[PDB]
């Protein structure tokens, strides 16, 4: 039961329609920016490789800087265009969604107060008002821009690949389906991770809220019975969580292995074509990166369709309600997990190995490209390219294994800790007294949210923090050390933008993820609707609601522009990094202080190392909130009652 496609934008005026049109135009322009950048990257790589080959030939760089000024200009132009287009897209789609959602909220409350007493259906109506409109917002908001941007990226990358090298383009097309499928599964797992963590506990949460809602339990003395009833559903939730920690991690590890195996295959075939003289290494780079990023994006834009369908489903009931025409017309924390040190040891080892996978990839990639920036025997070049393709495949296998192992070990330790903490907290609460239960800071809702959230958040201050820190160290620290060994001037230059690249990764992950007052008036009106319709305060309550929506409306309209500008700037910084790094690299290669191999190594190990650091740190939970919840859990566990009933 969904509304029509062109019926969900019924509350969009001419300004919202213009916003949506210009937003999808800017989204297409923004999506068509990465394949163009890969084209420019391939041309620049060809320049560097030809200069290096000629220098190695005439042994016994005079135009390199002049040629690289032009490509720095191209990089900067694409970066400024991406800045403008991404800002326009994000801001315009956010504005259109916000205005339509404001109108929908107002109309929905107006119609809710307009219903009849026989109509007034439950709780249910309140949850509808606070959740279905958020569903519509998520569906008609930035996700449409995401879908159009990724469609543009896919089509532009494949067009660039087919116009640059159709043989390699077809070879990577043959694996594009599994790449898009893995990207879609990855995005779905990331989008439905917290909802499944709630679904796993939804069974035990009912037993908790029923027992805590408690004097009967204390009187009849069934504390042990209710404790075992809770512990059974806790076992079930722990089993479901362990199954998820297995499945999600093995799927994402398979995705990583597929990415690296695509690297291996595509580079093996591309080196074959280059050694045969048909392709150049820059052409291979352009084709490979364009087609691969397009195939990944076309699968990355799969949750947008699900969000749109959920928006249609959620808007169906709201539109039916608002179209109803009634008859009448009115150390201390880590010790908690100390028994899981066998899991933590394996987790830390696998996190070290997983973090070290990015510098290893930088080394292998730089070496396989530097094979073609120098002259050598054909057989030697072929053997080196084969060895580096096999090394790419080994990187993929190690990535799969260690990613799955780290994820599973840390998730199992977290599930064990969560079950244990929930059990001890429920036991200590059942051991407490009615004098403790009467304390209005110990409300039933507060206790249930302590059991549901705080116990599940303590693991964020131990396993999650440890894994994130270990991975980010083993990645970026080793990358920076190797970059200082190989090219210290380029490393010193790129260290100035390392924080901005990490912040760009964080902001982009938050952007893909999608991360009071008016609710009070609404719930009071819905609860006391009999008295409201008796005193005929429908219009006055509508007025109070509309005035309580004003500050959130203005905050949303401002946050639209703020997040648009910050996202656009963080995106354009990734484009400007190319220009800066490779201009300085052209200088250093022309002045014989470094080679293009080392330039590529420093680039891949520093810029993309920081990007991966940001992408990983986007998954780290709030450490302060985790420690506060751990303190809460610990005090409730160690609380001893006065009138002991145990």
């Amino acid at each position, epitope marked *: 039961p969904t509304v029509s496609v062109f019926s969900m934008f019924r509350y969009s005026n001419w300004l919202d329609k213009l916003y949506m049109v210009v937003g999808t135009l800017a989204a297409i322009i923004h999506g068509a920016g990465l394949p163009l950048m890969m084209l420019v990257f391939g041309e620049m790589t060809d320049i560097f490789a030809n200069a290096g080959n000629l220098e190695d030939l005439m042994s016994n760089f005079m135009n390199l800087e002049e040629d690289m000024t032009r490509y720095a200009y191209y990089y900067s132009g694409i970066g400024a265009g991406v800045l403008v287009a991404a800002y326009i897209q994000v801001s315009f789609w956010c504005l259109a969604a916000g205005r339509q959602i404001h109108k929908i909220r107002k109309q929905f409350f107006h119609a809710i107060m307009r219903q009849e007493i026989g109509w007034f259906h439950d709780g249910e109506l309140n949850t509808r008002l606070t959740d279905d409109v958020s569903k519509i917002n998520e569906g008609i908001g930035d996700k449409i821009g995401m879908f159009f941007q990724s469609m543009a990226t896919f089509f532009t990358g494949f067009i660039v690949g087919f116009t640059r090298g159709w043989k390699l383009t077809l070879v990577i097309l043959a694996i594009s389906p599994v790449l898009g499928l893995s990207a879609a599964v990855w995005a779905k797992i990331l989008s439905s991770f917290t909802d499944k963590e709630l679904l796993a506990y939804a069974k035990a949460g009912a037993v908790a809220e029923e027992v805590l809602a408690i004097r009967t339990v204390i009187a009849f003395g069934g504390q042990k019975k209710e404790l075992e009833r809770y512990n059974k559903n806790l076992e079930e939730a722990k089993r479901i969580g362990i199954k998820k920690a297995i499945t999600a991690n093995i799927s994402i590890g398979a995705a990583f292995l597929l990415i690296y195996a695509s690297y291996a295959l595509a580079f093996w075939y591309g080196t074959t074509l280059v050694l045969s003289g048909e392709y150049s290494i820059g052409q291979v780079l352009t084709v490979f990166f364009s087609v691969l990023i397009g195939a990944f994006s076309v699968g990355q834009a799969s949750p947008s369709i699900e969000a749109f369908a959920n928006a249609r489903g959620a808007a169906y009931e709201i539109f039916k309600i608002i179209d109803n025409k009634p008859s009448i017309d009115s150390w201390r924390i880590m010790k908690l997990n100390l028994t899981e040190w066998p899991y933590f040891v394996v987790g830390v080892f696998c996190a070290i190995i997983n973090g070290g996978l990015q510098p290893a990839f930088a080394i292998i990639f730089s070496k396989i490209i530097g094979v073609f920036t120098r002259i050598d*025997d054909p057989e030697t070049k072929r053997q080196n390219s084969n060895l580096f393709s096999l090394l790419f495949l080994a990187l993929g296998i190690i990535s799969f294994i260690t990613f799955f192992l780290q994820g599973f070990t840390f998730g199992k330790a977290g599930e064990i800790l969560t079950k244990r903490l929930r059990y001890m907290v429920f036991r200590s609460m059942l051991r407490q007294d009615v004098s403790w239960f009467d304390d209005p800071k110990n409300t039933t809702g507060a206790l249930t949210t302590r059991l549901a959230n705080d116990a599940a958040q303590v693991k964020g201050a131990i396993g999650s923090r440890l894994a994130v820190i270990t991975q980010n160290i083993a990645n970026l620290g080793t990358g920076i050390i190797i970059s200082f060994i190989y090219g210290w001037q380029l490393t010193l230059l790129l260290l100035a933008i390392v924080p901005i690249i990490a912040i760009a990764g964080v902001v982009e992950m938050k952007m893909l993820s999608g991360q009071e007052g008016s609710g009070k008036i609404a719930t009071e009106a819905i609860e006391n609707f009999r008295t409201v319709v008796s005193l005929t305060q429908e219009q006055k309550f509508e007025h109070m609601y509309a005035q309580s929506l004003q500050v959130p409306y203005r905050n949303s309209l401002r946050k639209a522009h703020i997040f648009g500008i910050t996202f656009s700037f963080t995106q354009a910084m990734m484009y400007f990094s190319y220009a800066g790094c490779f201009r300085f690299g052209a200088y250093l290669v022309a002045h014989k202080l470094m080679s293009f191999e080392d330039v590529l190594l420093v680039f891949s190990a520093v810029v993309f190392g920081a990007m991966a650091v940001g992408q990983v740190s986007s998954f780290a939970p709030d450490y302060a909130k985790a420690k506060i919840s751990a303190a809460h859990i610990i005090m409730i566990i160690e609380k001893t009652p006065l009138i002991d009933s145990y």
Partner: antibody, heavy 122, light 114 residues
Framework: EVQLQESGPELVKTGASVKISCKAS????????IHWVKQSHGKSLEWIGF????????FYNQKFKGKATFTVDNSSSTAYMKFNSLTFEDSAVYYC???????????????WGQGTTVTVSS | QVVMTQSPLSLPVSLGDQASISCRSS???????????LHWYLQKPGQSPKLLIY???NRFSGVPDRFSGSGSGTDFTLKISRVEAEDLGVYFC??????????FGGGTKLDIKR
């Protein structure tokens, strides 16, 4: 089917200039150097120099530096060798060969042109 | 600046017989990477020189098994097992180890022995 088709025989006057061509077909033009070789009658072949078919960077034998100029037209995928102030000792057969940029001097001159006969006489 | 010397300027041969063309370099043609870059080309009148052998012994793609290459250091040899009618021409060697100056052999014309 790699082919390096050269221009026809040309009879020029002493002291003048002339430009011979080598049109490539059947392969990626911008991935090779075009080397020029000179063969006089009863003499072994002699390397004049090469040009990069990717950007146009040249290298000349120290004997021919100044009196020969290499150019490239990537649109038509042709290479040109131009003389300056020709003389009798310039009358010879000039060949064009291709060499992979990836393996310089570590790989033979796999394909050659059929040769251009240049007769210089006043 | 290796000076390549082709031992027989002219070599009279007969149909269905073995022919051997020698090449001597004024300097060792073995490279630091362990390879010797000596190539043998065949040139017919009015046609482009065709690559026969490269790196001493490796046969080019399409060349029949009639042609073989051997030797090392400063002494190399091209051998034709059964001189056919399509083998009469000028065979010249070429070194690629010591450049910029690519140098070639003097050539060896195959006359028909009567």
């Amino acid at each position: 089917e790699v082919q390096l088709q050269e221009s026809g025989p040309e009879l020029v006057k002493t002291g003048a200039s002339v430009k011979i061509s080598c049109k490539a077909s059947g392969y990626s033009f911008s991935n090779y150097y075009i080397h020029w070789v000179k063969q006089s009658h009863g003499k072994s072949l002699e390397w004049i120099g090469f040009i990069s078919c990717y950007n146009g960077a040249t290298f000349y034998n120290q004997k021919f530096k100044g009196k020969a100029t290499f150019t490239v037209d990537n649109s038509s995928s042709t290479a040109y060798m131009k003389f300056n102030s020709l003389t009798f000792e310039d009358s010879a057969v000039y060949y064009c060969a291709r060499l992979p940029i990836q393996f310089g001097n570590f790989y033979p001159m796999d394909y050659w042109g059929q040769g251009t006969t240049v007769t210089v006489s006043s | 600046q290796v000076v390549m010397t082709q031992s027989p300027l002219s070599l009279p041969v007969s149909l269905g017989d073995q022919a051997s063309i020698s090449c001597r370099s004024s300097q060792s043609l073995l490279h630091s990477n362990g390879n010797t870059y000596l190539h043998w080309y065949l040139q017919k009148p009015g046609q482009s020189p065709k690559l026969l052998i490269y790196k001493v012994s490796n046969r080019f793609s399409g060349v029949p098994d009639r042609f073989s290459g051997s030797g090392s250091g400063t002494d190399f040899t091209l051998k034709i097992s059964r001189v056919e009618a399509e083998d009469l021409g000028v065979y010249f060697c070429s070194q690629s180890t010591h450049i910029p100056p690519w140098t070639f052999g003097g050539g060896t014309k195959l006359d028909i022995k009567r």
